[PDB]
Symmetry: C4
Subunit: 486 residues, 4 copies
Amino acid sequence: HIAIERRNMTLVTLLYFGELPLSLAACTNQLAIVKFLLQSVGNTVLHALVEVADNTVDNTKFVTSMYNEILILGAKLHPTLKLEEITNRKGLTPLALAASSGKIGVLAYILQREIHEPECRHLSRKFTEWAYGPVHSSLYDLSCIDTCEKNSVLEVIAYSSSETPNRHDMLLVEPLNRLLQDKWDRFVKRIFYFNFFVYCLYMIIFTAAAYYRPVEGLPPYKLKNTVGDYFRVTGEILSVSGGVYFFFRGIQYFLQRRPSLKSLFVDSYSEILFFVQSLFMLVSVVLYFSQRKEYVASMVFSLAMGWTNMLYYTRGFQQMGIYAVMIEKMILRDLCRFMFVYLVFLFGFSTAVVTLIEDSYNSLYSTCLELFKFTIGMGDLEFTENYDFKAVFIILLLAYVILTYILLLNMLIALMGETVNKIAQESKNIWKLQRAITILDTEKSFLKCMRKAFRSGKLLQVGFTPDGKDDYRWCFRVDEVNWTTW
Amino acid sequence: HIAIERRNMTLVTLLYFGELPLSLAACTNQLAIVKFLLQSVGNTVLHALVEVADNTVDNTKFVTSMYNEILILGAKLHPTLKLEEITNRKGLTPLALAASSGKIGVLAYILQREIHEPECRHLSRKFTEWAYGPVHSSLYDLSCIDTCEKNSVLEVIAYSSSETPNRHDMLLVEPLNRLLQDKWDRFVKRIFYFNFFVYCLYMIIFTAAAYYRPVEGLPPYKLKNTVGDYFRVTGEILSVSGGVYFFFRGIQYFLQRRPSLKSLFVDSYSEILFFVQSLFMLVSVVLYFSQRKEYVASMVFSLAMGWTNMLYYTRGFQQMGIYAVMIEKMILRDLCRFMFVYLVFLFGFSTAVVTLIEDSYNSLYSTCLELFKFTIGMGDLEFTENYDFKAVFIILLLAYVILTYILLLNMLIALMGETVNKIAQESKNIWKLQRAITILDTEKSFLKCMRKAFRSGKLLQVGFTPDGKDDYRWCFRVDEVNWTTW
Amino acid sequence: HIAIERRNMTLVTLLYFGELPLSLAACTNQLAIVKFLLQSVGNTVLHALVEVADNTVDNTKFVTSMYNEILILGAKLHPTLKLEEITNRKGLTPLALAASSGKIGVLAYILQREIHEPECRHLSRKFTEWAYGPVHSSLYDLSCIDTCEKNSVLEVIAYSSSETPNRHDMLLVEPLNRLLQDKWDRFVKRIFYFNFFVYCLYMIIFTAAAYYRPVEGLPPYKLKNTVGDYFRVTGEILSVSGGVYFFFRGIQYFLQRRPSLKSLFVDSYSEILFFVQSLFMLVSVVLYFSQRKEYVASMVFSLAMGWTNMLYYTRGFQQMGIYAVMIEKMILRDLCRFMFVYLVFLFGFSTAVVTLIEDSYNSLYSTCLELFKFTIGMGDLEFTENYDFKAVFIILLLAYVILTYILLLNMLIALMGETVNKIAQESKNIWKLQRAITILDTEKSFLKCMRKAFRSGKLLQVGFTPDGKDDYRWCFRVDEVNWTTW
Amino acid sequence: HIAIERRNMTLVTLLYFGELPLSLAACTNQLAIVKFLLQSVGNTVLHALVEVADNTVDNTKFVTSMYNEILILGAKLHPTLKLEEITNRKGLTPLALAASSGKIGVLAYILQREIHEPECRHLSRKFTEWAYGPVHSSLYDLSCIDTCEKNSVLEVIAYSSSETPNRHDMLLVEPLNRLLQDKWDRFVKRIFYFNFFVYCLYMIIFTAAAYYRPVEGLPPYKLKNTVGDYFRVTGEILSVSGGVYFFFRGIQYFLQRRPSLKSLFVDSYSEILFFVQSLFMLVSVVLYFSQRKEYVASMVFSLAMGWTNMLYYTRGFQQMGIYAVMIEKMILRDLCRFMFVYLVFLFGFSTAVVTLIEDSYNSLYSTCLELFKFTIGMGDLEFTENYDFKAVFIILLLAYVILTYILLLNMLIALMGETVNKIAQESKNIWKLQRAITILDTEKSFLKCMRKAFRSGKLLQVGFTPDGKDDYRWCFRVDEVNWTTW
């Protein structure tokens, strides 16, 4: 390993990048050294090379060349023995490890690799079926990447908590995009539209049952034999059954995803929404059967939540999905830090004025609301009059008006603009990540109808393997037109 | 065709880009191959080449060189036989087909082509009359492009529904701009100004007749012999005659244009406006003669519409036309998707509060209006008081205020800014497209006074044709000054 | 001239750019041709060359080289005879003609020209006194440019109505900037500060006289012997004397400048302000002596105007001058075209609603004001109630609120942003143009104290002239440090 | 010196950049000249070279090469004699002089210099301990820079009043950043968090004591034996003890910093805040013991101030620190110049209207407040009615509404946007300067616990000095990974 450090083949022949000398010499980007040498962590040489990638053009070029040479050398050294199917200490394949790690160009290479050498056609991935003019008919296998039961690269990129840096920019490569469109427009689009109208009609039934709730007495109420009463009972039953579903789907989401506490609100914002919505529905029905008139309070929240929580489904549509992602970003970053700062100002001035006034229009609850109104421009500057020192009170409002209305809110608006301006293309692009998420969750819940489906499908035989036995895998055909190539 | 695919002249001599082998070999950009070979879809070789253009610099260079060689070869092969006058399956000329297709540079080439070879001066388009110093006096024919009765390239670019990608950037070439200015300042400017004052005085008469409408009784009313009554009767007659015109011009627009349902609101926004305006006028006069007092309601809409619909005419003036195009864009994109989303929020919270309150200030109509007022800052936070659970109601307003006022509207404003910032130059440029549209509609309605006019005019003889017979066409003289050329 | 057109020296030797063949050959940038040839419009060869400049790098290089060769050739051909002192048909010197025309680089060259050839040191402009290390002590004459009684280049650039394209970017060259700073900080700064406190105390006296105006009776009022009455009489006299001054300075400005009607509001915005201010003061004192109580109305306008018209003086200070130039730009461009468009909307909807309502809270004056309030957010949506068709009225407000408040004003705000964003550096730079304007007006009004002053001064003898007689002109010494030059 | 000016070694051998000829010849960037020559102001050759730097790439390259040659020549000429330890007339070291002056690249060079020549390893600064692969373990001494009792470079960069141009960009170099992180996360983070909760609980106790202040009688009040009275007395004592501290820490800040009057509000904004806060607390307790009921007025200000003054502590946290720096910038630049301009408008129109009205709702205090309300949109357009000339009054409001609401404020908002847009990265970067400031003040107040600590520490022996005696200094170890270097 020490000789590998100095790139010395002499002492090597005499005899953090792992410990095996070949691993360090490969990590030191000395292909001749490992070629001469060959001829705990749990990471193989491929996994080590995946970890070594720095997503820069020179590092990616070196890593891809090293991996191509390693693939050729591995096929020569052992044709029957698996090379890519090996799993690291995490259990991930090296492709999966690179996908998790943040190797955009490396993953693009693995997806799009083709072998000029025919004997290197054993491990090649990209294939070309024909080329009439400038239009070539290409073929990508992508057999394991879509639907391997252990792990799938699509899954790994999907369940990425933004810690992977270019985790969004990964799937921009042609097979992932193309396959994503295929799955969507094949069946995921239609079932998501069915999802949309089921939930929309759910929210309408929940709204009608809520609006025409019965009031007389304290709950529960006797179910009188009447057409209206029968309708309201049936509507309540359908509503609470929907509620317990959006509990169960949500809780299995948390269980199967196992999200961290910090990643919770910064990735699964829609999920927490549809969890809290069902949670309020459950608390409402509990209080409805616990002999309390407060149930409707809980009920109201879920109802309000639910319609505002409908906006996820516009995350479906493209032109609306960007627009949804804006609201996600602002409720996560800006209107939390800003809302704390405005709480600092609000609390400071409200305690100031309440200490200034002596007598009960002055209470800190009422005074904060009264000072809150100024920000929306509905504040009445006249306020109260029982207080002494009119100048010392008025300077406090004028300070609060200059500060929190003009200085602070406007500044916040500028900060938001700084958000929309950077994310106009960015969130545009992000939309297709949530597109992919929904596409995967479709296979998720519909396990029975997705494995049989074989949405990727198109099993085309790879041919003669390095072992030399005829074998078949799954493929998918593309068209690439390049007049510049001729 | 197979030999054309492999760029093989050997098997060709032995014997999607169409089916004829010359067509594919030209499409494969092998000029030597088609030169050796020569010496359903309905598209000719020129139409196929127009379809093959990809509006990139290399593709345009290859296509223009191929078309120049094809023009020389066609003139040599058959001088008398037409080459450009041929029509495709759509009936369009190859220039018209390229104009519809989205070939900016190709159309620029066809407009500005000149032939260094004198024997290629048969098909040349651009001509130079003289050059004193660096100032050359140029000549473009453009004989058919302006006013061919079958199709005109100006017409084709004009009646483009944004599906053609650079459909706006087409006419930026010098002859189209120059000719456009000519037609405008020659007579279209003056007749459009007459249009402006006719419609302005129409709206004033319609407004005066509306303001001083009679009220006593139910309509119609007896025409008493009185100076005021006579004025009001005459004003109503002039108004409804204008109304039926703006119906008839509009309906012939829809008939001659034959717009698609999706292109309807995204291209002809001004037209639908002046159609709905006349439509409300017609419904108003119908109810006026149908013994109903509701006529004025319909009448009012058209009146309001009409003055707001006057803004089209500022689409005439340059500095105002950009400003009009902004309002078009926002009522088409942003304040529709935003208005749906705010409807989601409005409806969710209004049903929430109406379910929370029990008793009739609470009705969903009144509650939506009451919650609507908060967005404009005129909302009264005190709202009602009959409702129980003051905290559970107040948290709902505070949620609605934070969400729809500060979070949502501001975000929408940022989105609009994202619109004005990108379109400051873009819509500036778009103004001259609506300039061209109005210029063409002038020839449209005024068929009798436009064909006689010959606004392009300036018939200059092309000279000796490839057939060898002296012929004359229409031209237009320019001045181009290039000190860099000397 | 024809031979000059073809750059042919053969036919020239045998024998729009003017008519003399040397003029065209120079304009055709053939220096060898005019060298061989030499050895109505009123424009000389230098004036023709100034007109020929296109402010591009190649054109400026060619024009400057041609002018240098022409200067050398003119000095050789006639040393005693003037070359630059000649005047065109306008009477301008070629430097003045280039300054008016829009020749930034040419003017920079004329200011900064130095001659490597010693015999070309006759006409050279820039001089170097010494150079210790990398710090050279330079000398620019600029003798006529500052204070020639006929015309001055500083004056010509100053009295430029933005039609000259780079009229602002002209004086950015080192001698004009440096001299401008000199004049300012020498005496113009102090006298402008005196100007500031004179006008400030004028506005305070005018405000105090206004606030404590007498009311009893109809004007004029008897001057009772009392300390208050004596103060108010004296204050009124001082006020109206200031008023008649700001009339007289203003009217001599219009007379000496002779501005065009279109250039009036787009250049001299501050002047029209200080003219209208004095005009209202005069109308007020006229009505005060015409036995009318309406005088105070006129008086009030001037008072309001005057304090708002004080903002010019912050055009003095740098950090405030940019800020003033913003308000100029917006009241000239955006809040005029926008205010017309909002008048279209306001008038349309106000006539709509007034036609809808029948009975007098409804009058078009009151209804426009009532609809005007919505834009500022002070509008009361409840409006009136006497009107029938509540839905048809409410849809009209909701349309007006969506349109003029959210859609229109916000869009206007975005347009303004588009203004401040482009002019943040631009108006920053413009500030020094108004700096120069004020500096020149100081010499203007103070004719007696400016000609004696010789603010440029520093008369340094040029030396041996091309005539060969010792002569002296005015100069100004600079320091230029260039470590890159050594 | 004259020979040094002309870069002449001949007259030098025969015999503003200082006066010694070697100093000028070095300043003229003639290294060969000073090499041949060697072999009041108080500035040495190193100090002169530091002053000569212009922070441009060529000037920095020349200055660094000259300083390296000067260091080698000084070590050869006198190994025992100090070279860098010399002090200028200000007493600063040349490194400190360059730090104060604005030499970013020069300071980066001095921090990161290493010597390829082993005999130049005497004066070298950067060291490398090892390199396994592409990962080298580096070592920077930085022994004096952190904690020399006379001056420290960290201190000099910290106490910089923005007059030094790149004073922020200085410490971006790796050792200063790294050391800064070390000191923070070692102990400054924890003690600053303790600072945060001490001050937070101080503000809460001050707020509770304020809210429940006693009212009966005139202060002071008898301390009755009661649990509430005992709590309030103890709370007041703790509050005023905190007040006198935030006086004493503040006044020793002003004393030790000795800030200039102009630098006062533009650098130490947080300090003046925490000084005024304690100042109001002191005035309040004075009036409380001076038998006056006005004490609470003073008290209220400090309380309001204090909570709003809490925002400094979010200058601690990163994502909040940028957000704090925005409010600093706007209260320093924009909402001062804007607030003066709006005072011009407010005062002009308020005096206008008060002169227009005759009778006491009209007073200039009440009228300015009434006109002030329009800006926040709470203004009531109806105003009063006692005044005559309704049209002449209404045109004045409409002028004020168009001007100060729409035209002026919006323009101001655009100006603010111009602020947030430029400072989104800039203030982001500035946050680490206030990070450094707090880190240094920690060592400041805690003198006893910082000198013993040796936060930089890690004393590693430099080795053989140029004198040749084994010596030891302080160091700090780094890791730098460069796969591009191999």
